[PDB]
Structures are given as structure tokens and as C-alpha cells.
């Protein structure tokens, strides 16, 4: 192959540079150097690995391409990754969209995709609410109110807020109770195709050692709840409820090309199911997230369609091949 | 393959239709236009979708038999199943014997199988109980208490009940507590032969989010607590405790053979595991279940004794296919 | 081959046996005679079925190396074992270092193994502990203190201390906040490699069932917490978790070396994973975990390295056969 596949040592590095090799590509890995045993001697799924965080004149002369890891971003930020000329596998224009509130906001509401509603002032509050002071650090200081009145009270205890003046720019949001559910997509600009590639439920700590933990024990105590992401667990979803849950896929990327010069490649919207069967999202990862690590050896929906295991790492590589082979490659390229 | 296989449009269809595909037959999907892309394009795994509830004189002339969804029945109705021309797999009887709470309680009862003791006079209860007022609707208004004056106070607050003779038809049931376990089985009636297929853990809201909840806040709100099914986690159990949950099994089908008339192929006990390692089981689902969906390319049970992805979908295919090779289609088929 | 691979009827002797099968051996179960069907009949795994505990003659004269089942030592006890005539997989000496709590906590010190800290004396309290009276009964009354003054009201309250004389014996443990997370791992003599083979979280009865019960409802009764193990849940971690993960099973084994005459095979660290994203462990099981049943058809992290299903039951019936082929079956076994 003329390219060589290339990514981050990071968050599915493993699963992308496997898929790589799958479909008949040399691999790189580059990042920390304390992680390399891992992608050569216990999972040997990069055949070089460079001891930098982003070794663009190696990965130029190598023929590289970029498969953007989950993680990608955050290690490297936003601007450096926006000038990247090692090319990059999907749409760079995506990630000030996914990053930013507002943008999203946007985007999910030009896609039609049910979230929960935001309330500018608190004695609009109606149905119970969340409140999040800023600035947010990964569930710090979180608080529900069921009304106006509730609100104050809590704004006084919990933030010294005497007059109305001095409520000092804090986030009100509809709290919107379901379970966790994390569908993985892949849309293929070769193919102008959607696809389901598997869902998962992501494991996170404290908040899911917490439901061990007898309310007597938990009531002693001031407890810190946090969201830390520590794995992943498969699931497959009620079967009446993939069309909407596709639909709402479809939707995000037609509105990307719209938006932002188009969404190819993984994404997932990160959401709960209520009771009543709505698929409520608070999040888009315009990117390859860590559920699908899960599903190497493929997924209960990708062996509905393929006589073989796909995971998302190897669609990604299969999308490439494809657009080599079709002479577009240019065209999945930022 | 002379027969066609047919589904309704939900449920396990897709699992149900690949399955199908993979032992030679062609397929057929019916049910509601809006799902019809599910089926033919994210998932091609009908060769023919009709787009009605039940198109009987369509089915007939493609030479079909319909292999029961899990919510076929909650869709069309008993009466109208009961009085199908098209060919159906399995035994129309059980369909009563499942739903009825009276015939199901007797089943389980002739198996041999530990259930929840019912109590008919609230003054009998000795252990902890849940009581279920008429008619339930999905674990409304379902409270707990621990012996017949906690019981009388509850039914004054809750119910209104000051008087024993005002209290209206409910129902009262040992409080059982324990991890949700359904093992999914298959009766093969060629073969005269019992198999465990796979194991699940349902995945339920918001009964699997309040867990996520801290007991402070959980407090503050009069909470609404459902089983509102979202989809389906793969487990396995310990290997001890297998030999009883098989066990179960055939005592559940040799007593379907002494009261309705049999029960062949797919079939799940719901029920819990105790501290204690008891079974405990509150349904039999005399059909295919939604947590064999997670095993298209096999699970950790099926494995271990073929050569080759069998999910309960495929299976059921297997066991036409070889009643057709053996000449004896109809004795699988009402 | 030469040898047959024989195990212990219960806690992973499927999956051993079916390993075993697939690299060419013929296979022994022994053990209860009730759970024969189980082996020879639902999952034929077992070409020979002994209906005895440990029948040492039969094994010698069919040329058998016993697999160490999970619950083996269990069932026939550390001094039986330790005298086993019939060849055993693996070092007999580890028996003794992962039972004895004291040469257990050395192992994981000189491994370098973050474990919840000790508390020898309850007035050096500074962070909540967990007090677990003896002798220790799976989790049978154990309690949260928070600071000295804080434990001594508890002692007084539940175990009837009223002078600090009078404290006898107790476990007083930094209570470590986290979810339930066990790594699998294989340590290959023949090779002097470690493999990472699976994860999975393990499924307990009632403490996995409790986090469906509203606060409310937990209120009312006087609750008795329990970790009966039911069952296994599939889990990937993080991928920037599994350095540290691999890591300290490469310090666990070559910890082993120095101390015990070596690790080989099959083991698994117990453990949570903390907010802060440390792994703090419990318990080793230096022998297979029931975990490792689910991956019967491979796991996530073995497809990333194998061209084929392995499962740690495989694993250990390929090093058996390499070991045969490279005439070294003497280092591998005690
Ligand atoms: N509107 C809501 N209703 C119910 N639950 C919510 C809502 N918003 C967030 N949550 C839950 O609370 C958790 C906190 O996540 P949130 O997005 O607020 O911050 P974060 O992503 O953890 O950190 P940061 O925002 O700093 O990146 C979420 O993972 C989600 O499970
Ligand atoms: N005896 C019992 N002990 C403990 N838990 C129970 C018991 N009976 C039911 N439950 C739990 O409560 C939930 C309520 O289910 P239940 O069968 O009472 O109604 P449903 O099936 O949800 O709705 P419907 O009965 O209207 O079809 C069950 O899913 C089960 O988890
Ligand atoms: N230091 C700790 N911090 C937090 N949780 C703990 C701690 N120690 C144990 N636990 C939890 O409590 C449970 C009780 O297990 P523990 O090892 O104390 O006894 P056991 O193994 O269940 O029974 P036995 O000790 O009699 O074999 C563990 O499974 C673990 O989940
Ligand atoms: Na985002
Ligand atoms: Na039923
Ligand atoms: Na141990």
C-alpha cells in the first residue's frame, strides 16, 4: 500500500493499528515511550514506533496518514492539530464543532437530536433541574433543584448567593434520568453510507462503584461523585429502537455538510434512555470513541452484514483502502 | 429450501433473519414501513419486506413459516396468532400458558421451579413483601413491607384502606432479592434435546440509573421507579450453578409435554440469583428472548460444543432445515 | 499426545477441557456425579468422566496433568494438593502465598502493588476506614468509621467495646473507593513471556442487586450486604490503563521468582480502579478466574495478537503442548 497508517499511543491506538495491519497497511504508533512495549511486544500491532508526540517530518517522510485517536486532541490541542500537514482521516473542520458548547448546541439542534433543555434564568425552572457552577471540572459541586424557591435556597448553602445580583454565570440544565447508552457510528464517504458498527456502556468511577454502597454507608458520608472513564461494557439495544437511534446518525452528518464541510469516519452520540423510550443526548464525539475497543473481533451488528470481524479500526482501514483503490483518498483527507 | 422464513419487524428479527440467511433460506420481514431501511439497507438481511401487521395471504403464497418474535404476540394479539394459517414455529398453546398469570404460576409449579410465595391475607406475611396493586402497570405504586402492621399502615397511607373489608384485589409477594440472571434456552424437538444458547443480564431504566444516583439526592425526590426494557448485557454464571439452571429446563419442557401439548424451540427463565445461590424465577418467556441478540456470531456457551457462530436465531434455522432433511417439518411446526 | 489433560468438575472446567480439545489432547473431568451430563452430555468437553473427588490411580494410569480449576484447592484442600502424586500445571508452592492473608500482602508489597493500607492500632485513623470483625465471613458485618473518636462509638454500638482492653482482634482497612475491575493474565515458562489474556468484571449477589433498590426502600429494613459470586461481565479497560496493569503483573511474577520458586500460567489480580485512575488490589488468585469463561471464543485484547479464539483455558493447553514439543513439560509442571 502506498500509505502507511499512523496514530496516537493512546485511548485505540491498538485497535486502529490492528485493523491497519488487517487490511494490509505498515503501521506507526508515536507517543510516550513508557507505552511502547505495549503496541511492540505484548500487542505487536505497530511495526514502527516513534518516541514523540507529534513527529510530523517522520510521519511525512514515512507516507503517513493520521487515524485522529479519541484522545488525539487533547494531547496535542486543538490549534497544532489544525495545522497539521501530515493528513489527517476525516474532517479537521469537526472539532472546534464537537469542543465547544455552543457550537454543539447547534449542531444537535440543526440535527434535531432531543438534549436536555438549558434554563437562563432560574425562576424559569418548571420540572427538576441541574445546576453546574464554573467552571465545570468533571461533575464538581453538582446540584439538583426542583424549583425556583429550591433553587435560592441551594444557591445561598452552596455558593454564598445572598442577592439575585450575585449569581455569577452558572449552568441550569433539564436532569434527564435514563441509562448510560453509547452507539457507535461510521459513515463512509466512499460509499455516501451510514452504518451502526456496535454500542457499549461506558464504565466510569466513582459514579458506578457507588450503586455497591448501602444507603445507610452512603449517608454517613460527603461523598464526591465522579465520572473518571475507566472501561467499557458491551450491550446490544432493544431492536425497535435502532431506526431513531440510525436516524439521529443520519441527521447529525447531514447536517455536518451543511455546517462544517460534512462528518466522515466514527462518531458517537453520548446519551441516556429514558423510560419513555427517548434516546436523550448530552454529548457528540465527532471521532472514534473507546467503546468500540470492545469489538476487535467485530460486534452483534457488524456479523449481522459482514461474513467477517469488523471493528471500527478496521472500517476505518477498510474505508482507506477503498478510497485508494477508487482514487479518492483526497477526498477522506483534511 | 422449499419454506421461506418469516418474522414480524421487531424484536430479534434481524438475529432472527441472518440466522435464516446463513442454513440456505430466503427471507421475509413484515411490519411497519418506517423500519423497512433496518431490514434492507443498514441490515440486508430480508430478501422480501412487507409492509403490513400481518399479511397472511402473502406469507401463504411465499411459502412461509413464521418463526415467533418475542413481541409478535403483544403486536397482533393472542386470538389473532392463535387463529394463524400461516405455519408457525412451535406450539401455539404455550402462548396462554406464559401470559396467564394463573396457568404460569401452575408450570413453574409442576417443574418444580422456585418462585416468589404469594400471600393471599396481608395477615399471613412473616417475611419481607412487595405488594403490586391492581392492575399493575409496570411496577406502579409497588411498596415493601416486613410484617402485617407495617402492612395495615401502609395500606392506610397508600391506598386509603381504614377498614379489611375495603381492601380491593392485590397482590402480595415474597420480597425476593437477588441479581437479575436469564438464561436462554433451546429445546430441539428433531434432536429430543435441550441446549443453553447464552446468558443475559437485561438492561432496564430507570431501575440501572438510580444506582448512579447518590442516596442524598435520591431522598429529596418522590421517585418513579420502571423497568422499561433499553436492551441487553452478555454475562455468563458460575460453572457451578449451571447443571441446576439446565435442570430447570427440562423440567420446565417435560411438564409443557404433560400439560400443553409441549414446548420446543427458544425459551428464557427470568428470574434472580440469590446470596444464597438459588434460582428464583418471576417469568417464563416460552419464545426468543432480546438478550440473545448480543450472540449473532456465537456465545461464550455455544463455543464450547460447535465448530461455527450459532446464535438461538440461526438455531431455530437449524432445526427447520433438518426437520425438512428428516421429512418431518410438521411435527415442529402449528 | 502423551499426556491427557485432566480437571476438577466445576468453576472453569469447560472452558479447560474445550481448550484442551482444540490443541489436540484427550480429556479427564472428575468430580460430582450429578454434574456429569454437564461435561459429557450439554457441553461433551470430556472424552473420560471419574464420578470421584480426587481419583489419584485412574489419573496416574491415563497419563494425566491436572489443570488447576479456581475452586480446586477448595474442594480437596492445600495439604491434598501439595501431596498430588499426579502432576499438576503450574508451582504448588504459590498455593500457599495467595491464601495466607500475611504472605499474600508481602507477595503484592515486594511487587510493588498499590493495597489498601493497614490500620494496627483505630486511634491512627485519618481517613474512613472499613473495620472487619473476626473471623471473617464474607463481608459479615463489616462497618465505616471515619476518625478514632468516630470508631469507638461504632465499637461500642455493634460489637459491645466499652474499654479499649476489650477490642479483640480485629481487620481495620483504608476504605478504597472504586469499581470492580480484574485483569487476566498468562505468565508462559516456555516462552518467559506475559500475555494479558481478558478482563472481565465479576457479578455479585446481593451487592450488584442492591443499586436497584431506591433509597427510600434500603432505609426501612436493617440490610445484610453480601459478594456471593453469581456470574462474569466482559469489560475492556481504558487503553492508557493497561502499562500499569501488564506492568504489575510482570512485578507479581518476577516477585514469584525470588520468592516462591516462580509464577507460571494462569492468574488474575483483584481489584477497583479509583477515581484518580490507581489500581488498588485486594486479593491475588494466582490460578484461572471465572472471568476467563466468557472469552471461550477470544477476547478483545487476545484478537489483537492471535489469528484465532483463545481462551486462558487454550493458552494453557498450548503452553502444555509446546512444552511437549520443545521437551521442557518437566519446568511447567510440580
Ligand atoms: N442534563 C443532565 N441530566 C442528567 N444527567 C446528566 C446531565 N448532564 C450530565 N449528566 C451526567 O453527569 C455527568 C457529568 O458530565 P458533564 O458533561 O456535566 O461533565 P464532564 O464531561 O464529566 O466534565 P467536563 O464537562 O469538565 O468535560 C455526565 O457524564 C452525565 O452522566
Ligand atoms: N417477588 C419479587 N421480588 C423481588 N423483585 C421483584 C418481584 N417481583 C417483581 N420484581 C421486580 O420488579 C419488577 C416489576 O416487574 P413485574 O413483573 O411486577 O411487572 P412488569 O412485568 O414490569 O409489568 P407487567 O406486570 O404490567 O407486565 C420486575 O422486573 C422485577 O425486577
Ligand atoms: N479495603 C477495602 N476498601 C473497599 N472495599 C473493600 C475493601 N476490602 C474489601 N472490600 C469489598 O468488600 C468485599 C468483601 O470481601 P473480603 O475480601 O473482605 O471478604 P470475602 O473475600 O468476601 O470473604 P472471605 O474474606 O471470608 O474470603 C470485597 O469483595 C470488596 O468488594
Ligand atoms: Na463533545
Ligand atoms: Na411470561
Ligand atoms: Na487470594
Not at 47 to 68: G, Q, S
Not at 71 to 94: C, D, Q, T, W
Request: glycine share 6%; net charge negative; with cysteine.
Amino acid at each position: 500500500m502506498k500509505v502507511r497508517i499512523a496514530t496516537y499511543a493512546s485511548h485505540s491506538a491498538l485497535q486502529i493499528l490492528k485493523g491497519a495491519k488487517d487490511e494490509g497497511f505498515e503501521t506507526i504508533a508515536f507517543g510516550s515511550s513508557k507505552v511502547k512495549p505495549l503496541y511492540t511486544k505484548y500487542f505487536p500491532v505497530a511495526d514502527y514506533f516513534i518516541e514523540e508526540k507529534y513527529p510530523e517530518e517522520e510521519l511525512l517522510n514515512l507516507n503517513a496518514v493520521v487515524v485522529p485517536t479519541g484522545s488525539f486532541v487533547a494531547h496535542l490541542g486543538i490549534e497544532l492539530v489544525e495545522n497539521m500537514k501530515v493528513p489527517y482521516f476525516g474532517n479537521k473542520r469537526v472539532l472546534r464543532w464537537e469542543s465547544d458548547r455552543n457550537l454543539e448546541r447547534k449542531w444537535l439542534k440543526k440535527a434535531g437530536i432531543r438534549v436536555p433543555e438549558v434554563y437562563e434564568d432560574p425562576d424559569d425552572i418548571e420540572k427538576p433541574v441541574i445546576v453546574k457552577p464554573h467552571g465545570a471540572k468533571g461533575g464538581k459541586g453538582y446540584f439538583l433543584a426542583k424549583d425556583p424557591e429550591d433553587f435560592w435556597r441551594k444557591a445561598e448553602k452552596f455558593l454564598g448567593i445572598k442577592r439575585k445580583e450575585d449569581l455569577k454565570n452558572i449552568q441550569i440544565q433539564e436532569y434527564v434520568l435514563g441509562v448510560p447508552v453509547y452507539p457507535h457510528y461510521f459513515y463512509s464517504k466512499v460509499r455516501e453510507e451510514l452504518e451502526l458498527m456496535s454500542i457499549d456502556r461506558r464504565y466510569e468511577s466513582n459514579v458506578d462503584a457507588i450503586g455497591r454502597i448501602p444507603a445507610k454507608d452512603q449517608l454517613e458520608f460527603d461523598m464526591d461523585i465522579t465520572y473518571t472513564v475507566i472501561g467499557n461494557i458491551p450491550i446490544v439495544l432493544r431492536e425497535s429502537l435502532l431506526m431513531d437511534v440510525i436516524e439521529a446518525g443520519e441527521r447529525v452528518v447531514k447536517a455536518a455538510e451543511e455546517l462544517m464541510g460534512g462528518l466522515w469516519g466514527p462518531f458517537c452520540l453520548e446519551g441516556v434512555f429514558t423510560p419513555d423510550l427517548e434516546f436523550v443526548v448530552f454529548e457528540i464525539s465527532a471521532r472514534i470513541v473507546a467503546g468500540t475497543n470492545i469489538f476487535v473481533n467485530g460486534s452483534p451488528y457488524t456479523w449481522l452484514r459482514y461474513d467477517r470481524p469488523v471493528s471500527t479500526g478496521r472500517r476505518i482501514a477498510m474505508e482507506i483502502r477503498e478510497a485508494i483503490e477508487n482514487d479518492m483518498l483526497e477526498k477522506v483527507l483534511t
